[PDB]
Structure 1
Amino acid sequence: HSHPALTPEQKKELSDIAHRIVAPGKGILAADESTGSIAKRLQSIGTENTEENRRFYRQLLLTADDRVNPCIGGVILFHETLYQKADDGRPFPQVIKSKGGVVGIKVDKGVVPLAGTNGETTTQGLDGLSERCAQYKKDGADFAKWRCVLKIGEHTPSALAIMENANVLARYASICQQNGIVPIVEPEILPDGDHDLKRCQYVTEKVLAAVYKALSDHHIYLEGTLLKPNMVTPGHACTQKYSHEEIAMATVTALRRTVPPAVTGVTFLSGGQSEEEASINLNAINKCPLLKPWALTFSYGRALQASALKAWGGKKENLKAAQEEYVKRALANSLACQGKYTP
């Protein structure tokens, strides 16, 4: 028997939000980094992590030139960054929505270990998620982010880790879709270890199949969701070398065997790649000569802002040049999500 989780108006608003995020030429900037991660990236450059420095760095990221307006369609923020204001007086949700962006927020509470496994973790953050998502909906956020961590090892990912992470992702996506917030499913598989394209493609296909079975079990409206996978790439310790079009063929092949075409867009990770190989691999994915019935774009945290952070240097007068760095990468990734990129 059919009891609708969503009225057609809810399905309509979720569909147009998800269509506004992955619009052609546009992608996602991931500024969702919590205090420890931004703290260690500020200690790598040599700046002590305080609240004004974080506000100023995300000010540098968000108040850039308007050439990134048909580049960035969505911005993922932290919980703290929603309630921080720019020096002009506008809050950062208004600063994003002023130039055509969509406000997002990271809503998970980290990873927690699974007992009985070999270093496998599940993820946290389901309690009070309805009230938090309603509050973030009043604060201007239209989509969310939630990250699962899986690793390829000697007998990992096991059935327990894949089943539990898919179940928690589907529960999260149901809670977000009840409040009018587009969920972005991120089943990230770690590039650590020594494994070829074959085992990464196998693991990615099994993980994505279990994720979409869990989404069908939990009555998720697939047109109002986004997918945030990795690119199918070999491990860091793997000695075999692969062309970019081989990685692109493996990625589009693993996506076409699992992902139903009702899903609106696919935004890839950077995932420890360097800043140029992300645009190279995304460009090679968008010229793969297969039929790809969804939006292929980027959701790059580090590969959008690494050069801007390093050319910032922690002092204010470098700002514009730092911003200028970011601008190139944004436009580059825009061409990388249109197949027109050439290094």
Structure 2
Amino acid sequence: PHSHPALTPEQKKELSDIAHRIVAPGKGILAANESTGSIAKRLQSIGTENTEENRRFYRQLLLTADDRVNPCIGGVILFHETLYQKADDGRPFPQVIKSKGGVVGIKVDKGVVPLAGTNGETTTQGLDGLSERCAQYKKDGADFAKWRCVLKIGEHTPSALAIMENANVLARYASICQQNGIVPIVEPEILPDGDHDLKRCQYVTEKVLAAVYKALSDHHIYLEGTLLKPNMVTPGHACTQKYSHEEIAMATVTALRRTVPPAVTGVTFLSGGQSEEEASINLNAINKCPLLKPWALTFSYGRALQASALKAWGGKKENLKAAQEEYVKRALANSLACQGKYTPSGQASNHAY
């Protein structure tokens, strides 16, 4: 019943300003933090050798896209390796990102691990020495972090243990980040795998987020200095029933309205397995949903922003411009979507839930 301030007014202000810059009107996040293992399949999909130089060239391709992306990108999440690489001119990537008006992010979790006694459920590791890592990343240009927890909808999942443990670890991660001036992006991803319908996803999302915020409260987390990266509420990939984008938007916004405190500065949606176009249309619909939304509703896309770019590149230097153009096009589309101004042309119920 007694307070022992985790943060000073100055620390809070710093975290809040960082959080607001990332999700400023019209801006979203480019998630380019794929590890060697992740980008391996992507490079192979286009027959490109997975070397540090190729990864640098690819990341540089995205990071150095023309100024059209400036008002679209509020933040860029990088993998450890990328945070210390440089563009051809010798400029550290963090400097490139900042010069274009973006905030630099860094992935800090150490992957998922199995939870014994559950049906294939997991939690996420990475707290050991996290404080020291955060202080170092802050000094090296990062202002926000990424940590991914994964839950699955199944016959007996997410279980009480999985929900409780993932919510608790996310709170510890958020607490350590804030102690070091790093805005933590809380990511409790509920996989779309399965044949469950829309209302089941909405139900599970509602229960998971309620546990998440109770945990953040218990750990004295400063919500204004945080962002939320949840799955959109959608039917399972194998669901026989079909839904409109309007219904997906209503279920998503309704779930958030019932669980996310208005103090949370912004919600940056993960696209899961949605196509580039699908992720933009859904985000736009979410923003057009006729319900009050007290937080920014934008994006934090990876493949949903890189798919076409990667394909257009093909690992050939001569395709640089064509590749950057595909990326810029998705950045512009999502910039409009997070404002509810998206249209395929380019620029120009409720109680049942």
TM-score by length of structure 1 reads: 1.00
Shift of 1:200: 0.3
Secondary structure of 1:183's match? strand
2:49 corresponds to: 48
Residues of 2 paired with 1:159 and 1:60: CA distance? 43
Write the mapping of 1:103-182 to structure 2, written as runs, cut at 5 A: 103-182=104-183
Q: Distance in 2 between matches of 1:51 and 1:223?
A: 37
CA distance in 1 between counterparts of 2:78 and 2:340 reads 28
Shift of 1:304: 0.2
Q: Deviations over 1:108-128 (max 9, x none)?
A: 000100000001011010000
Cα distance in 2, alignment partners of residues 132 and 342 from structure 1: 42
| 1:164 match: secondary structure | helix
> How far does residue 283 in structure 1 lie from its aligned partner after superposition?
0.5
Aligned residues: 343
Give the drift of 1:88.
Answer: 0.6
Q: Per-residue displacement from partner, 1:201-249 (whole Å, max 9, x unpaired)?
A: 0000000000000000000000000000011001111110000000000
In 1, the alpha carbon distance for the partners of 2:28 and 2:103 equals 11
User: In structure 1, how many angstroms separate the alpha carbons of the residues matched to 2:100 and 2:156?
Assistant: 47
Cα offsets for 1:121-167 (capped at 9, x unmatched): 11010000000000000001000000000000001000000000000
Alpha-carbon separation, structure 2, partners of 1:2 and 1:185: 24
Cα distance in 2 between the residues matched to 1:325 and 1:58: 14
Deviation at 1:99, TM superposition (A): 1.0
Instruction: Confirm whether residue 213 of structure 1 aligns to residue 219 of structure 2.
Output: no
Post-superposition Cα deviations, 1:71-104, rounded to whole Å, max 9, x if no partner, equal 0010000000011011111000001001100000
Determine the C-alpha separation between the residues in 2 that align with 1:119 and 1:276. 32
User: Using the alignment, how far apart are the partners of 2:293 and 2:134 within structure 1?
Assistant: 32
Q: How far is 1:62 from its partner? A: 0.3
Distance 2:98 2:309 in 1: 22
CA drift of 1:265 comes to: 0.4
Deviations 1:30-77 (A, max 9, x none): 001011110111111111211100000001010001000000010000
How far apart in 2 are the matches of 1:324 and 1:14? Answer: 33
| 1:2-40, Cα deviation, whole Å (9 max, x unpaired) | 110000000000010001110000000000101111011
In 2: Cα distance, 1:86 partner to 1:198 partner: 46
Partner residue in 2 for 1:229: 230
Q: Quick check: 1:311 aligned with 2:312?
A: yes
Alignment match, 2:321: 320
SS in 1 for 2:315: coil
Q: Cα offset for 1:185? A: 0.2
- The alignment partner of 1:5 has SS state of coil
Secondary structure, aligned partner of 2:261: coil
**CA distance, structure 1, for counterparts of residue 31 and residue 260 of structure 2:** 23
SS, match of residue 177 in structure 1:
helix
SS in 1 for 2:113: strand
**Hey, which bits of structure 1, 4+ residues long, moved more than 2 A?**
none
Per-residue CA deviations over 1:238-296 (Å, capped at 9, x if unaligned) read 11000000000000000000000000000001101111000000000000000001100
Secondary structure at 2:143 match in 1 = strand
So what's the TM-score if we normalise by structure 2? 0.97
Aligned with 2:183: secondary structure? Answer: coil
SS in structure 1 of the partner of residue 268 of structure 2 = strand
Matched residues in 1 for 2:280 and 2:47: separation? 28
- 1:334, distance to aligned residue in structure 2 (A): 0.4
Please give the alpha-carbon distance, in whole angstroms, between the structure 2 residues aligned to 1:85 and 1:48.
20
Residue 186 of structure 2 is matched in structure 1 by 185
CA distance in 2, matches of 1:67, 1:236: 34
Gaps spanning 5+ residues in structure 1: where? none
State percent identity of aligned pairs: 100
Distance in structure 2 (CA, Å) of the matches to 1:95 and 1:45: 26
